Amino acid sequence: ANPCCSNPCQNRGECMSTGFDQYKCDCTRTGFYGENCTTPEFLTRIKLLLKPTPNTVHYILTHFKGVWNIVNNIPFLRSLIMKYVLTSRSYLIDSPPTYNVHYGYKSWEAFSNLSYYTRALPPVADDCPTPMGVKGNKELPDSKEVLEKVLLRREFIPDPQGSNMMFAFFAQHFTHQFFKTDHKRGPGFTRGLGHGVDLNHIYGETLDRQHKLRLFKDGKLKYQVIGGEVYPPTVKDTQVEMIYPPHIPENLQFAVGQEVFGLVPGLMMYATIWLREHQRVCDILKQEHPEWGDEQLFQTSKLILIGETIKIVIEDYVQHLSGYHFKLKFDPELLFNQQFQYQNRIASEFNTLYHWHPLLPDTFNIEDQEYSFKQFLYNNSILLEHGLTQFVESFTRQIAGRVAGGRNVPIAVQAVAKASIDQSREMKYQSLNEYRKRFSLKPYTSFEELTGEKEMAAELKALYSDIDVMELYPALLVEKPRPDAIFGETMVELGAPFSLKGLMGNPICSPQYWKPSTFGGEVGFKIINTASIQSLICNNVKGCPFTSFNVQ
Amino acid sequence: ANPCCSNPCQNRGECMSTGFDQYKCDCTRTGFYGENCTTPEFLTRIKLLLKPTPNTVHYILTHFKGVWNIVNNIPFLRSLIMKYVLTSRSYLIDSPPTYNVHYGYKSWEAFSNLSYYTRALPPVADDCPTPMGVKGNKELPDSKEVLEKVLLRREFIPDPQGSNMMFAFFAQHFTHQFFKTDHKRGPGFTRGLGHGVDLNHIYGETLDRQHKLRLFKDGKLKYQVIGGEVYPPTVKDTQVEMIYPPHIPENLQFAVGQEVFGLVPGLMMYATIWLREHQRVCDILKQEHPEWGDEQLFQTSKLILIGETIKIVIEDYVQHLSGYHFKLKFDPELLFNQQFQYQNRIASEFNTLYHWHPLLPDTFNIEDQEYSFKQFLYNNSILLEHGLTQFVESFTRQIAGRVAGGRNVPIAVQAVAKASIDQSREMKYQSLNEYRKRFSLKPYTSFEELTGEKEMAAELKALYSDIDVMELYPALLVEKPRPDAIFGETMVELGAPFSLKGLMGNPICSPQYWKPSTFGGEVGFKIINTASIQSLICNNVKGCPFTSFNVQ
Numbered sequence A, B: 001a002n003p004c005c006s007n008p009c010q011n012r013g014e015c016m017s018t019g020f021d022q023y024k025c026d027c028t029r030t031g032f033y034g035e036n037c038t039t040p041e042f043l044t045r046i047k048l049l050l051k052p053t054p055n056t057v058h059y060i061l062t063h064f065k066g067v068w069n070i071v072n073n074i075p076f077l078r079s080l081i082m083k084y085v086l087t088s089r090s091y092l093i094d095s096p097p098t099y100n101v102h103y104g105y106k107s108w109e110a111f112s113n114l115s116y117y118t119r120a121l122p123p124v125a126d127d128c129p130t131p132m133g134v135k136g137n138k139e140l141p142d143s144k145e146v147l148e149k150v151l152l153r154r155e156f157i158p159d160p161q162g163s164n165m166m167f168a169f170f171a172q173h174f175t176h177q178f179f180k181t182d183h184k185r186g187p188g189f190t191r192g193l194g195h196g197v198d199l200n201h202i203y204g205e206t207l208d209r210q211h212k213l214r215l216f217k218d219g220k221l222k223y224q225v226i227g228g229e230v231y232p233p234t235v236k237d238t239q240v241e242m243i244y245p246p247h248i249p250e251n252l253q254f255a256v257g258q259e260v261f262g263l264v265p266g267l268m269m270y271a272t273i274w275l276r277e278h279q280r281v282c283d284i285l286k287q288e289h290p291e292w293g294d295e296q297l298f299q300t301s302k303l304i305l306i307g308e309t310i311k312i313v314i315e316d317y318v319q320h321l322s323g324y325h326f327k328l329k330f331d332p333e334l335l336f337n338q339q340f341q342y343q344n345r346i347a348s349e350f351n352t353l354y355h356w357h358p359l360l361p362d363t364f365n366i367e368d369q370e371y372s373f374k375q376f377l378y379n380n381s382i383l384l385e386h387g388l389t390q391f392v393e394s395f396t397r398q399i400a401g402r403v404a405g406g407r408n409v410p411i412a413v414q415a416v417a418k419a420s421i422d423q424s425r426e427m428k429y430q431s432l433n434e435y436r437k438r439f440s441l442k443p444y445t446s447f448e449e450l451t452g453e454k455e456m457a458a459e460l461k462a463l464y465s466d467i468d469v470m471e472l473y474p475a476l477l478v479e480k481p482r483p484d485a486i487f488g489e490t491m492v493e494l495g496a497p498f499s500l501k502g503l504m505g506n507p508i509c510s511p512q513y514w515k516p517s518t519f520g521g522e523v524g525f526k527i528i529n530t531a532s533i534q535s536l537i538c539n540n541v542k543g544c545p546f547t548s549f550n551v552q
Ligand code: HEM
Pocket: A168, A169, A171, A172, A173, A175, A178, A179, A180, A181, A264, A351, A352, A354, A355, A356, A357, A359, A360, A413, A415, A416, A419, A420, A423
């Protein structure tokens, strides 16, 4: 019934049910007017008729090495550039957050209840004619008819950017502090209440849990020595609850912080990395402040690490996943003179679209041995046996799958990829084009437009019929990759904005926190600003292995 | 021991313990440098040597009626002015919030734990030589040697601004959504987790409770008809827990929302006001959207009411409490082009300094009768008997005490006034001057400077000895009143900044929410912007009595 079913209002205008059969578009603060918020004000016209495509943008940004070389040299230019990528990229986020799974209208419950995931686009009214609003059939294609037909891998497709397993597992561990779906409540419900890079994954989801992992000495995190290496405390020792198969030796049962992380040795490898990083900081802090107490050292360290994390995640991770030329820069002071909300609330889309299982290899090959999913998952001795350095090295040299090519999901994790499809449907998501429009992209004219090939296109077209009924999730993995990109424009466009407001819109990035001392000193401050995944490992791993987020 | 005990760093520079015996000042982002952040950069000099005193500011603002008249006529001027009062006033707030009772250093716990009250000035290190850091004696004056000597009232002193009982009880009910100290945890701990004007006081502190008050019909709040007037549901009826003396008839036991509000008939009078306002909106919304459901009408209503509340609290409450000439204006779009954080976290100072018991009369005189505290407190039949209109009228005509004159605290509420003193001491607060400096005010040279008279000055001087050991709280009520002001500069300066970021720094005030429709329509939006305490009553109270926040 709901007259706004049909998503009438374009250009961002909010739609409203003015009488069962009627609706009105709140074109307020859009650049357009007229019943559907579509006809522009001259200024708009001028902007529009002078705006370059994310691709025409991407081209420049990925070409002209030498020039970008010159820019990367000129500091008073790199910053100008960085400042801009930052500023514009995030105008697309509604922070303060609007909407969630149960609120299609602004609502204070949608604003207060931190247990939800914000949502870039309001769900589809439960009283609509079709699940995509008005277009489509009484039902949508079947999940497996998309999962198998268009999503499951045949031959392992390698990423054309050389994303290794170091990167792959990092993107998993990292995003896993904010992504934490509270399934007991349902999809759309999170447990990463601190909506953002709160390093909760290392430090326990609470205070109570955070305490059960702390040594309460020199600001240190509890650890344990196995043969000669520091490994996380045991659930048996520090009663911090974990998730482990009812047979794991109880000596495997590592503690780490984020309760799921024990289900994959890659994760557990990274926690052991950071666990060690904390202490390492703690000591530095401890000899810069011989008079600090445990609680201070601890509280200052978590700040520093977070500081480091935002650096690596921009200077290395985004830098790699971008494949630019221009050198991205983690510099909070760049946003200081601009309007910015040092506030964030993670959406469900960001979660969904971040399901990068296509990154996953068919064998977890730790040099001089390859393991099956069945063997790698929930394994104690794998990590303990091989060693950290022999993980760092294996992973530096191991191509991970390309993401948005088509049909590259590990037949194992096909179940997950399944859920994703039929779960995002449960959460009543919107059509792939409404999202494209929403993120200032132009909707696709054909499944063929979406894919850049004919085979799948026709397979999907067969199923979905209308392009305007294609889903955000599938369309993302079976999307035409920009050049030798790991994924296409649609992925890259919805996610860039979301991934920067969670990094930058973080208290430490605030002008009130961004100063030495907040980090114990000038010292601590100059740890954040010298961070790199390269150092993270050379500082914490038995050798000082070379590493990267690229396959050498 | 802590080298930062003596609060060395001036001009905002954060102080840090660099070695037991040493410290450094983080003059970063201040206008000053040099060991203590005190010597200015030329630009600073220029600003300073060109900035007008809050008094030299106040004078203009309270004088020249005719000019201000001209201004209040010119809309393209009033706004310019309003925009300014807004912008500058709040540069003084650390949002994102830094500090709380347990954190003298930035800390992530201080940032995360929403159960705390932020704190404009960090507490005094528990290892200091004197409770005020380094100045003063092993102890401070006694509470009663201040409570009695300088704070308890003798003759009722009337406010020179004509603040009536309508205003008095409004300032109580209103601030009582944000102020809600969780004493079980201790002072410094709140229960108004939605740090701000979340109208939780009308709607229950939760979701669970909010449900136990709603009708789940037409978006309406539950009510009950007693003789002919709508009065809140009964605890017995709506199991919403309340706080009532173990003898109250169980028919008194009104529900309303904020659990304490039953302990004073004035509070209960105002809740009954709003309860009725909700419904009144709900019906308007209900015949604007004949197709809305209860949950939508309810969710849209709370937003409109909040909208109204911010209007009244600026346009009437602040407007009256200011005694300006220039017509303040609630216009969220004024901050749209300025850097602003639509985010807030209520401090403990704001709470403490807002203890305006001096406002309280010795008799709650509802025309043709006068009640004792003993009688007015927790009374059923008072309100039910007299009626709302006969409360509105009594209160419009009833002068309330002056606040910051000296010695005007009701001997009843002396206990509260006591707590305040020795509680803010518990929370380890700082000297009256550190705060004055903190809020860009010049510290006092004598108790005499503080008071503007000689009697009390010497009585306090006797006690405190050093002016620099005078406390924020007492010095606030025993402070020299600006002209015919209800309180002086110190109160007005710490609070103005705090009271605006809680109003403006609210999601609905955001450019993402500030549009029609968010409020159900242009209609709902045009309720917020036509709001007034005058209307609030004429729309909800049996007559349509004239009212104000001034004694006629
Ligand atoms: C050993 C490899 C991995 C396994 C076995 C695995 C398994 C799973 C499973 C069981 C789910 C839940 C199913 C659902 O979403 O409905 C899931 C969710 C997810 N996975 Fe993985 N995953 C792995 C690696 C990764 C990596 C490398 C990334 C990150 C780049 C990733 C990102 C996600 C995301 C974002 C979700 C949603 C998390 C949430 O709901 O909060 N996964 N994965």
